[PDB]
């Protein structure tokens, strides 16, 4: 029904250019979506979704290898055809602790092996606030290890800014596959996304919608702007299409997040338009350095990758949680 296509990974190996988000936010975590999350996933995966974001921190990692092994007992697909992500914490920095974090997440979501693990964030911070101090690239050390055993087929990192993509890719034996962080109207990351794909490292974007979607003093573009529907009405789209196809005209993977089936549908209805050298321009006149995204509470710690707001305790929810 939908036809994603996939880019290629520095590792030899493709990721598909969108996958289904699987956070379902910190409002306090919430789990009262679970289980529109997993049917809206049963859905995406019948449309022809393969790509799969998931992390440890997300909680429901059980719940999602369920879907999975019901979607391939069905013969909807085979383990082969999707990929899967999961993500390490900010408490398993020691290289050691990779190998700990990453079989149990593996053990939730029953399987061998993920296509991709993902180090969550650069900072080493323990379930009580203490900052470790830990050097990502002996974290780092951990994610090569877990390469060799077998345990994924590719390892990357997230939210890392440009120096610290620079020092990894200096001193790293295995490259990063990808750098998964934000990107959206607002927030186009220019001089990091270019810095990424010149070393091959393929971007891939969490909140793609930045502050567009309802979910306050917030910038341009809302869903009503004009510029956004104009461009809709040109090359039939939506709103949230026009912002999608952006980013994927731009070479970057998006990882949108929905329980909806129609937004499901809607988010992958997005691969058959070029957007014209007039329309690219609006579009980046959009980008204004607003990030959806900032976690304050992590400023003081060492590896904190944002520019820092001078002059401001971590919530609970951020730091220890059960999983299923
Ligand atoms: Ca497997």
Redesign the pocket.
């Known amino acids: 029904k939908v036809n994603v296509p996939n880019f290629k990974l520095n590792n030899g190996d493709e990721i598909p250019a969108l996958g289904y988000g699987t956070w379902l936010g910190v409002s306090d975590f919430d789990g009262t979506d679970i289980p529109k999350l997993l049917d809206a996933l049963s859905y995406a995966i019948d449309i022809g979704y393969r790509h799969i974001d998931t992390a440890h921190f997300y909680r429901v990692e059980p719940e999602i290898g369920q879907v999975v092994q019901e979607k391939i007992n069905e013969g909807v697909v085979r383990?082969e055809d999707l990929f899967i992500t999961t993500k390490v914490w900010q408490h398993y920095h020691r290289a050691a602790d990779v190998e700990v974090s990453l079989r149990a997440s593996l053990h939730r979501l029953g399987?061998?092996?993920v296509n991709l693990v993902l180090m969550h964030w650069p900072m080493s911070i323990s379930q009580e606030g203490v900052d470790e101090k830990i050097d990502y690239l002996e974290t780092w050390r951990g994610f090569e290890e877990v390469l060799k055993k077998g345990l994924t087929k590719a390892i990357g990192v997230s939210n890392f800014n440009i120096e610290q993509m620079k020092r990894l890719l200096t001193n790293c034996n295995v490259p990063p596959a990808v750098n998964q962080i934000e990107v959206n109207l607002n927030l186009s990351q220019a001089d990091l996304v270019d810095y990424c794909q010149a070393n091959e490292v393929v971007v891939v974007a969490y909140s793609p919608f930045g502050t567009m979607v309802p979910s306050l003093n917030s910038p341009e573009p809302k869903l009503d702007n004009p510029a956004m529907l104009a461009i809709g009405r040109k090359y039939g789209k939506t709103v949230t299409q026009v912002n999608l196809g952006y980013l994927y005209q731009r070479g970057i993977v998006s990882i949108p997040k929905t329980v909806t089936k129609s937004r499901v549908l809607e988010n992958a209805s997005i691969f058959d338009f070029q957007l014209d050298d007039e329309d690219v321009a609006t579009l980046a006149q959009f980008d204004n350095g607003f990030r959806t995204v900032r976690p304050l509470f992590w400023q003081p710690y060492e590896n904190y990758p944002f520019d820092v707001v001078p002059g401001q305790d971590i919530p609970i929810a951020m730091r220890k949680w059960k999983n299923g």
């Open positions: 383990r399987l061998d092996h």
